[PDB]
Design a binder for this molecule. Sequence first.
Ligand SMILES: [Mg+2]
Ligand SMILES: [Mg+2]
Lengths: 140, 71, 148, 108, 97, 59, 40, 155
Amino acid sequence: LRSRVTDRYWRVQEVLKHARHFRGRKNRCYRLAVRAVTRAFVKCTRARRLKKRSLRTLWINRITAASQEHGLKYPAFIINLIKCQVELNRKVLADLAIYEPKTFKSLAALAKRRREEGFAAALGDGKEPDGIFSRVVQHR
Amino acid sequence: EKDIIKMLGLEKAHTPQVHKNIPSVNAKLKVVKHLIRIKPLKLPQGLPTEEDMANTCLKSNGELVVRWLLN
Amino acid sequence: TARGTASRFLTSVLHNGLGRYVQQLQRLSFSLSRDAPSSRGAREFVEREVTDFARRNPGVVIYVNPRPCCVPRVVAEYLNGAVREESIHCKSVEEIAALVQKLADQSGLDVIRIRKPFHTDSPSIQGQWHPFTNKPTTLGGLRPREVQ
Amino acid sequence: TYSSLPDDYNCKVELALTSDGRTIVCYHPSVDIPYEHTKPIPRPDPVHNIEETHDLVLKTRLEEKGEHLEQGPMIEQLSKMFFTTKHRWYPRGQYHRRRRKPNPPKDR
Amino acid sequence: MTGKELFEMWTITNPMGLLVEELKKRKISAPESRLTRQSGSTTALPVYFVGLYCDRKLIAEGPGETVLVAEEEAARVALRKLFGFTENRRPWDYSKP
Amino acid sequence: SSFSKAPQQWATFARVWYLLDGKMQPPGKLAAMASVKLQGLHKPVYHQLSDCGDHVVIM
Amino acid sequence: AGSQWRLQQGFAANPSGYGPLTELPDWSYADGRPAPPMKG
Amino acid sequence: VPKTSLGSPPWPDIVLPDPVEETRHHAEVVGQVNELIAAGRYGRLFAVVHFAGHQWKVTAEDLILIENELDVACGERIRLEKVLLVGADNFTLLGKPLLGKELVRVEATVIEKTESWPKINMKFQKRKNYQRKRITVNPQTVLRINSIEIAPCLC
Ligand SMILES: [Mg+2]
Ligand SMILES: [Mg+2]
């Protein structure tokens, strides 16, 4: 009983469809194509993890542009926004910076204020003053 | 040290685990003390009753709060 | 892969869910064999579930054809014009039910990479940043070295 | 009468804290550009193409402009206009023109 | 009508004139085109921001490649404020009275 | 906020010319801000595949 | 960042932990009936 | 009082207003904004909302794609509860880190339940003869956010 592979055609297409848009002989020849496709998938998943880093770095660069406009460096802006209990991820913060320049100038005003309050309290050397924006609220 | 960490329940990182302060335990902890952070458990509201088991939570200052999020 | 395939922005057909929600699935056609084992699940589904399904969704027309086939299919068809083919071949009643549900709740848009998770017309309320938006204006509106 | 940032530009920004303490509110009306800070629209229109003798000749004198250059110098001039390097302006092969998508996705 | 503009569907060809008429109706007088912001005049890609002023208050403002284009824009913007067809405008109500 | 599409987009990606005086400045500290403004990294709309970058004139 | 401050103030070093940000049931039916609880 | 490059700190001196006048000023401003709300003089609102583990910048009539399943029928209206930021052309409300449910209400409809396009995931190792190829399909849910309403109560 001899058995040969009849469907080999389709076996090949499932590789070759992913190779269509390559340059050179990689987009035809099953040998070359197979290796190239595999490399393409691997590169793809690795890039799926990378993409998230890339985007977050983008957002940080944009937020830095936006802050620097208002004479406020990036770290100051971010941590002094945290110290106001305002938790907005960098995605949203960048989008505000682009599409909501007003609200962003407000946020920047807040941060700047909170920072100055911090310096004031550190130089003051007493427990009595609590800056208006340096107050820490608990959940209700 | 790998074994000591395994038998302290410390397998997963940045997860808290609670242990008696008896010498038996302190011995192992002493072996791995550079791999860990040890902070005393505090009970402001005291130990939980059986009505309070579902509402218990552990705050980072190392303190166990019995009533979490009333209404 | 993403460079490999086509892509689209996130959209609704006919701004669905804005004014009111319209179930996008239009008709559903089953083809199965009374005799063949491959269609077994699909038969059971037609017995018990189809009826109830038809009440739960008044807006979709369901055509059931017994015919001599080896591979039972369900053809979903949408308001969009979109036609989506499926094979119910050799599945449970449970599996088919879940599948028919997926078909019921889909938009009929093509399934491909979606470029970004949100879609907004007028994202920009209160302005959109441009190089001048944060710059101060001067007196007379002179340039840096300009004299008057 | 205090804000952390000057009101010169963008919005005048007011930062208030709710009496509760659990909400920050910001009032930010736009700041319009003062008249005294603007300069009058430049107005330039002059037509000298007119010949007093024949003015349908004059109207044909404005249609009298055109020229042709070689590839190289055309590109140099083009790249001086837009402050680009020369390279952008050269063509591209069959293979690259063929893979441009016929119908790119559109947002908005 | 979602996402669409006003002048996307209205198609009117002379914004300035229409503005002047509407301001006659509102008993306001003479919009004056006043150049506000500009970058590069000598460039192949200039940017102008022309403001429109009525009694030295600024009613509306717009961008363009050319000072003319921009003036026309400021007109369209002013129009859009007057008519209350705007981006910031209240989104439509879908509700069951 | 209400602009037509084309002028809006044009205003956003508009180029700008900065002037930077050089007298008695370290070429390094100069080149730092010059570099930022050349790459258009001072624009919240920045991306590496947008052409955005501005002219800088140092004197 | 800013975990140090968040710790001095007695919250979780990560905003994701145990705050009202995470704990609360982020949606509900329009009628006001509660939503099925969240797996997390 | 001499003056050297150093003896004076190189940064503007700061004066922050007295706490009392500030509390007054704040109550005054809040009063103003609150009037703006009660009068209905805000044009269109956007809101930053925490949902399904992510934050979004949301506005009426819009669309978001949630990467996991929600148990709701298609067509159900839903109140997204956690709201970080609300905003309008002339003012913005900030949460710490949340807005009271009495202050703002954003309702979204679920349009479409679906599944993600296939995502290939491939592990590979040089000359170890090890490949694995796995195709992921993620269940997805498309919400149309309907309305952001904001109630006059603020203090
Ligand atoms: Mg991950
Ligand atoms: Mg998990």
